Structures are given as C-alpha cells and as structure tokens.
C-alpha cells in the first residue's frame, strides 16, 4: 500500500512489507527513513530512534517490520522508505527496499 491517508491525531501504521524471522535478526539491519532523514534503525538488535520521533514510534518487528506512530501531526506528511540489509559473508547486501507515502488531512 504505497499511499495511506489517516485523519489527524489518529494512529499511523506504516508497513515495510517484508517479514524477517527473529532468528535471522542477528544478521539483519533495518532502517526506516523519510526523505534522507533517519527515522529508525535496528542495527543487529540495537534499536535507535531519533529525537523527532523518539516519543511516538513503536517498532513492531513481527508485523512486517511495521512502525506505529501515535498522535499523527501535520508535519509528518512525506515519503517513508524501509531498507533491510542481510549480512552476507564479508558484505552487507540489501535484500528489500520498500516505499510508503503518508498523507495528512487537515
């Protein structure tokens, strides 16, 4: 679902569209970003959320690496991309790239 539009103040569920088994998360790096601005990182099980999203961003690993944003704000409109890297022998290989756009009605 490339395009998702939610009314203000509601819960925005942005889906990465890919599922990574909990066993393999040791060799996987997951990044959610918004127009070259980092939103969330999950480097080898070490999670990291930037200040602008630290309070209102729940990362659901099991539900297709989705992100739940509570209290959607008019400044959250934009394009989000989810990138997953699998640690092949000696290298990091991108195994999935997704793009989801969020629109705000106000």
């Amino acid at each position: 679902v490339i395009h998702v539009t939610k009314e203000v103040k509601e819960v925005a569920t942005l889906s990465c569209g890919h599922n990574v088994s909990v066993e393999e998360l040791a060799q996987t790096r997951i990044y959610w970003q918004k127009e070259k601005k980092m939103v969330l990182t999950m480097m080898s099980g070490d999670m990291n959320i930037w200040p602008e999203y630290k309070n209102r961003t729940i990362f659901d690993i099991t539900n297709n690496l989705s992100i739940v944003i509570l209290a959607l704000r008019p400044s959250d409109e934009g394009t989000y991309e989810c990138v997953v890297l699998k640690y092949e022998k000696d290298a990091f290989k991108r195994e999935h790239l997704a793009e989801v756009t969020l629109s705000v009605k106000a």
């Binding site: 790096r29 070259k36 990138v83 092949e88 290298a91 990091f92 991108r94 195994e95 999935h96 793009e99």
Partner: protein
Amino acid sequence: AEYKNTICPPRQDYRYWYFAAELTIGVNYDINSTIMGECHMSESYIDRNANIVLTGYGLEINMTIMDTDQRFVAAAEGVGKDNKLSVLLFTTQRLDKVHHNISVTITCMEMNCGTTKYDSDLPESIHHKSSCDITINGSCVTCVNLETDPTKINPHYLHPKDKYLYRNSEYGMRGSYGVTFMDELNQCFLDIKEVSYDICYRE
C-alpha cells in the same frame, strides 16, 4: 507477416536517449572533481545482450543487460563528495515492460588493484523479479548502488542541447541493487544536482 517492433539499427550519433540506469560507486582513494575527457566508453549489442564498458577515474566498469531489446547510446560520469562516482547510462527506447538481469564488473585500474575480491548475486530489492551478478576486482570499492529505470532521479541536469531525453514514470519498472563493504550504512547516495557530469567519449 504480422507486424512486430524491432530494435533500431546502429548509428554514429544517437539523438533519442532513454535513462536506462544510474550507477553509484564509492572508492577509498581521492577523486577531486569532474575532468573533461576523462571517461571513455565502448558499447556492443551482441545476441540480445547489451554491454557497456566505461574507463575513467581509475575504474573500469563492465555492465551487461541480458536478453533485451535495448542498446546503449551514451554515458556520463561525475564526482561528488566523499569520493563518490556517479554514472548515468542512456540506451534506446524501452520496448517491453520486463525486468532484465544485470551483470556488473568493477575493476580497479589505478589504486588498490588486486584479484577478485567480491563475486555475488544481488536481488532486485523492490520487486525481486531479477538479479545483478556483481564482481569487484580490487580493494577500492566500499559501496555500490545501481538504480534501473529510475523515476525520482532527474536525468536532465545539463541535458545536452542537441538530444531528446526520456525517463520512466512508473514505480513498477523501478529496480534497486546495492552492497556496502563498510560497517556503516550504505550511504552511497549522492544528490544528482550536487554533482557535475561530463559525457563519456565513444572510441
């Protein structure tokens, strides 16, 4: 006796360019700025396979599109910050809406030469309907990223005055491949408007 579209015959000069793909390569040795006449190019459409060989900035790039109705017509190169090389590739018009397998071989020619250091197959991230056979000879490449049929990228930049340019407008035909050899994230991105490009010379 039923009409079918066919690839165009070869020409000395091509005026109609289709933005086939964008290739980004990061190196661990210094490249400062774009140089006129630095990049040289060779092209070959044999069988249904299209091959482009680029030499410049201490690298050789050998890219092959397998079983396609496209022919390479031009290439351009530019240097960005952090020793990043951006390569734009232009072919003839796209006839069919099918993803083609790619083969990319990067070889170091001026710094940090060596035997085959990497050889693998990269899935097509967005759709997973093709793959890229990647081979790196040397210890110079830190990241590689290839975008086939880019939509977001704007290939007009300093669009050549005597040519016509066309680009893809569909998300379904986009393709992305990439590998990073450094512990940090890929960070092989470089804005097109912040780079200065020069056309490679056919020889």
